[PDB]
């Protein structure tokens, strides 16, 4: 087993812990834990609308979200002292960049 | 040593997060947008 | 030369005017809405729904579970310290 | 050694609970009250549009 | 319309309504949302004016 694969499990568990337990029973009013992902959605939306400017611009709006959030979450986990390096494996991250 | 380990489990989580966020977590908020605008416009 | 008749031509009028759309919209909007926060089901228990009810509703909404989750990582790797170093 | 870094983190989280969380409280409260205000006002407005 | 006014007075749970009830009262909701994802117009037009963008930038 790998502690880095366990870190990926922690990533997916926090990602579940950003929307699901966040949503107080599918309310219109958009509670305080939901305002976080609301603002993140809008600051990526207003970013990549004016960035690529396509007539069909939102089609790549999903991937730019999921390429953001992985890097946004994996650099909020090792911030805790007693951890191991998540994003500091240059092999994995540069491999991701080569894929992109 | 463990380039295969980190790379393979990372790619599996990449495919998971792409299909996951796309099918669930973005349009669950887009429904909130469309619902608020459909109440406000009536 | 004869009696003209526009007092009673509201029969096929009441589709064409513009607030008819808003009227038929919100007579549909108002019937199935629950009255006063009814059917709320304010308590549910699935061994962790109490955690959401105490922490993750609109009322409490304070960052403390993050704090708890912060301590969770403080709980996690340090024990792995005792497994490794 | 590494307990010094967690001690800095405890001081930082003390500063966060002192400083940031009431500001984000005010921010979320302002956005919440604004959304609830506009959402209730549109409903009352088309109530009066029915009354017209 | 008097019945609609009476229904309007007692049935406004305006800070606690579930969007699932809005999907249940309007399949137009899910129809427009699904067509919006299928075309990909993630921009919601007519939204920024009365509801703020609220982001950092």
Structural class determined from secondary elements of chain D: mainly alpha
Q: How much of the polypeptide of chain A forms β-strand, as a percent range?
A: under 5%
Strand segment count of chain A: 0
Q: SS-based structural class of chain A? A: mainly alpha
- Would you report the number of β strands of chain D? 0
Helix content of chain D: over 70%
User: Distance N terminus to C terminus of chain D?
Assistant: 74 Å
Measured by residues with Cβ under 8 Å of the partner chain's Cβ, the largest interface is: A-B, 27 and 25 residues
Largest sheet of chain D: none
| Inertia-based shape of chain D | rod-shaped
Query: How large is the count of helical segments of chain A?
Result: 4
The helical percent of chain A reads 55-70%
- Terminal Cα span of chain A: 27 Å
C-alpha-based Rg of chain D, rounded: 22 Å
What letter string, H or E per element, gives the SSE order of chain A?
HHHH
Number of helical regions of chain D? 1
Radius of gyration of chain A: 16 Å
What letter string, H or E per element, gives the SSE order of chain D?
H
The assembly state of the depicted protein chains is part of a larger assembly
Broad shape of chain A = flat
Largest sheet of chain A: none
PDB class: biosynthetic protein
Keywords: ATP synthase, biosynthetic protein
Entry title: Monomer yeast ATP synthase (F1Fo) reconstituted in nanodisc with inhibitor of oligomycin bound.
Chain A: ATP synthase subunit a
What does this structure look like?
Chain D: It is found in: Mitochondrion; Mitochondrion inner membrane. Chain D: It comes from Saccharomyces cerevisiae (strain ATCC 204508 / S288c). Chain D: Belongs to the eukaryotic ATPase B chain family. Chain D: This is ATP synthase subunit 4, mitochondrial. With 42 residues, chain B is an all-alpha fold. Chain B has helices spanning 3-25, 27-41. Chain B contains two helices and no strands. The radius of gyration of chain C is 30 Å and the shape is rod-shaped. With 85 residues, chain C is mainly alpha-helical. Chain D is rod-shaped, with a radius of gyration of 22 Å. Chains in contact: A-B, A-C, A-D, A-E, B-D, B-E, C-D, C-E, D-E. The A-B interface holds A 2, 4-5, 8, 11-12, 15, 19, 23, 28, 30, 37-38, 41, 61-63, 65-66, 69-70, 89, 91-92, 95-96, 99 and B 2-3, 5-7, 9-11, 13-14, 16-18, 20-22, 24-26, 28-29, 32, 35-36, 39.
């Amino acid at each position: 087993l790998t502690t880095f694969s366990l870190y990926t499990i922690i990533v997916l568990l926090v990602i579940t812990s950003l929307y699901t337990l966040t949503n107080n029973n599918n309310k219109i009013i958009g509670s305080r834990w939901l305002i976080s992902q609301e603002a993140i959605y809008d600051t990526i939306m207003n970013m990549t609308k004016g960035q690529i400017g396509g007539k069909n611009w939102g089609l790549y709006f999903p991937m730019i979200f999921t390429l953001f959030m992985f890097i946004f979450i994996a650099n909020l986990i090792s911030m805790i002292p007693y951890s191991f390096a998540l994003s500091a494996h240059l092999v994995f991250i540069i491999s991701l960049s080569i894929v992109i | 040593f463990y380039f295969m380990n980190q790379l393979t489990y990372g790619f599996l989580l990449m495919i998971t997060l792409l299909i996951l966020f796309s099918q669930f977590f973005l349009p669950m908020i887009l429904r909130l947008y469309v619902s608020r605008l459909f109440i406000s416009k009536l | 030369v004869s009696t003209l008749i526009p007092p009673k031509v509201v029969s096929s009028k009441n589709i064409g005017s513009a607030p008819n759309a808003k009227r038929i919209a919100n007579v549909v909007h108002f019937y199935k809405s629950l009255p006063q926060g009814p059917a709320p089901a304010i308590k549910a228990n699935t061994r962790l729904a109490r955690y959401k009810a105490k922490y993750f509703d609109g009322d409490n909404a304070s960052g403390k579970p993050l704090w708890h989750f912060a301590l969770g990582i403080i709980a996690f790797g340090y024990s792995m310290e005792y497994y490794f170093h | 050694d590494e307990s010094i870094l967690l001690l800095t983190f405890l001081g930082f989280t003390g500063l966060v609970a002192k400083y940031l969380a009431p500001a984000y409280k005010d921010f979320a409260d302002a956005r919440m009250k604004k959304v609830s205000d506009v959402l209730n006002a549109s409903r009352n407005k088309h109530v009066e549009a029915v009354k017209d | 319309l008097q019945s609609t006014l009476d229904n309007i007075q007692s049935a406004r749970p305006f800070d606690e309504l579930t969007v699932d009830d809005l999907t249940k009262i309007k399949p137009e909701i899910d129809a427009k949302v699904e067509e919006m994802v299928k075309k990909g117009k993630w921009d919601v037009p007519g939204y920024k004016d009365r509801f703020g963008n609220l982001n950092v930038m």
